[PDB]
Amino acid sequence: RVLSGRVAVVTGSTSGIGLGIAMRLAMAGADVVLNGRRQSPEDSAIVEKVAAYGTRVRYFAANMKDRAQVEALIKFTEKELGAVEILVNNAGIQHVSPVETFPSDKWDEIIALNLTSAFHATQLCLPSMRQRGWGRIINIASVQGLVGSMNKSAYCAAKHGLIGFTKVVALETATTGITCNAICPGYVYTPLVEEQIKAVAEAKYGGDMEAATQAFLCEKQPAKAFVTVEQVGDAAVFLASPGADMIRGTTITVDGGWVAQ
Template identity: 35%
Template sequence: MTNKLEGRSAIITGGLTGQGLAIAQALAAEGAKIAVGSRALADRKNGEAIARESEHIVEARERLSGYGGIVYFGHLDVRDPDTIAQFIREAEAVCGPADILVNSAGMTSEQPVCGHSDELWLRIIDTNLTGAFRMTRACLPGMIERQWGRIINIGSTAASVGWKDNPAYCASKSGLLGLTRCVALEGAPHRVTCVMISPTWVETELMRNNVRELVEREGRGRTVEDAISDITRQNPQNRLIQSDEVAALAAFLCGEGGKGITMENIQLTGGALW
């Protein structure tokens, strides 16, 4: 722990699992105050909190509380402007205004263009792209006012390389790259950077679920483990990228060493194209 981010406040969307949780942990280790938002966290009905404590929530609390800093967990659906406004109000009350925003919330569902429903298309775009736009729109003015900020969008190699049966996901990540570049230009005069980190397959529960969906659709007898082994062999480094690698890069970009890195799409691939 170097406390390079001591006094800074970070919002991480989709921060309960996988890359989001790893990034939250890396930033907490550097002394940042952490606000984790997720749809899986406590919802509200008639002003009362409804606890939905899953094993993921318990694990996240344990991992982040170990650094002794301020941590806030709140319900956040990036598709809903009202919950965004409520989450940001509550996060600011605990952690202060956001200096760092990590747009990690995302989803995918593999479907071919032919037969892809409007509802699924819009849900993926709304989560992966419009959700990041809404969060940025909410946090960027304060960063500009304070003349310091870091916005990190978690993208994918899908932003640059097409993939069969992934039209909505590829479109959303391509759009996220365009958003990243526009935000970087808007923030540049105010010491606000915006960068997209685009990994290839990252070994997470989400990846496993995606692979499970893939093999079920194939219907040719491959197991999930067989498919993951095939994906691993396709990587020139013969391995899967790990969440802590994404987190380490994010932590660097949030520090002073990353202040000149903006408008970039940094691919973390081990040499793989996808």
């Protein structure tokens, strides 16, 4: 297994894409630390699901908007499993609103979680990676980091900024065994997206989720199909593998053709 022995931390990995990434990393042999904002009654089941692949799996609740809790997550991983070798910055939120009425607090929260938390986690993990001469920082961006979409100003700004950050980290580590790269998914059927589909279904299609899902998807995604959490996880495993030793500062876009048009 290509990642056997490596210690990975996936932020926001209690559901959706984050859980899919953690699952795929474990299948590839990595020990994994799962993380959610607050402790959930589903945490034990999630940890056992990931542990089914025979690696060491832990859970640590931490609000990634709080730098002290980011540090606590890293220290917990170092105590339980060892030095963080793979860092996946995934935790992120969405808020759909036109620019004129976009709430200031929601803008600030999206910037804080989708961009600044990745900076804090990366800052905390890089010293050990440099000392060991190996590391992977994998930032879960979006197609919205490469193009714009209406009513997603804060999210598009934060994801564009996360891609910029990725480039700089990669350039500062380019002569080391540390790489930094971003994965840019298109639409994946998570709760983050199911809520948006609900909103459009109520507003436009009489609550019909089949019709609304197709209209939502086909607006943006030429494949007329969702990307899966399994595919995003496969991209993360690829970036963490030796074949990606010279992939630095780039985007792996998994989007059904969204950015190609």
